Amino acid sequence: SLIFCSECGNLLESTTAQWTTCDQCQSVYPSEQFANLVVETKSSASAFPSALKLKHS
């Protein structure tokens, strides 16, 4: 769910700043194509020591 260039591999900088261009390949790309980058992050299991978790096991 990331933004790599295709000429260079340069992990490009965020487009919410401006138009996207790799710092080395200087390749131009339409910034709006990959707008709305969603990363839904979830806490891993066995992450909160409960006083009821054993009642859940």
Partner 1 sequence: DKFRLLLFMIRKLYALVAGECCADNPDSPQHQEILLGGFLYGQILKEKI
Partner 2 sequence: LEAASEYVGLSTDSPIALLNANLEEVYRDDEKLQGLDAAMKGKMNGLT
Partner 3 sequence: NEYLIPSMMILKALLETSDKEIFEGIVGKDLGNTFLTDRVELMLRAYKS
Binding-site residue positions for Zn(2+): 5, 8, 22, 25
Q: How many angstroms separate the Cα of 31 from the Cα of each of 21, 25, 26?
A: 9, 16, 14
35 near partner 3, rule: CB under 8 A: no
37 near partner 3, rule: CB under 8 A: no
27 near 7, Cβ under 8 Å?
yes
The distance of closest approach from Cβ of residue 46 to partner 2 in the complex, given in angstroms and rounded to an integer, is 8
Q: Based on CB atoms, which residue is closest to partner 1, 36 or 46?
A: 46
The distance of closest approach from Cβ of residue 47 to partner 1 in the complex, given in angstroms and rounded to an integer, is 9
Q: Residues 6 or more apart from 26 whose CB is under 8 A from it? A: none
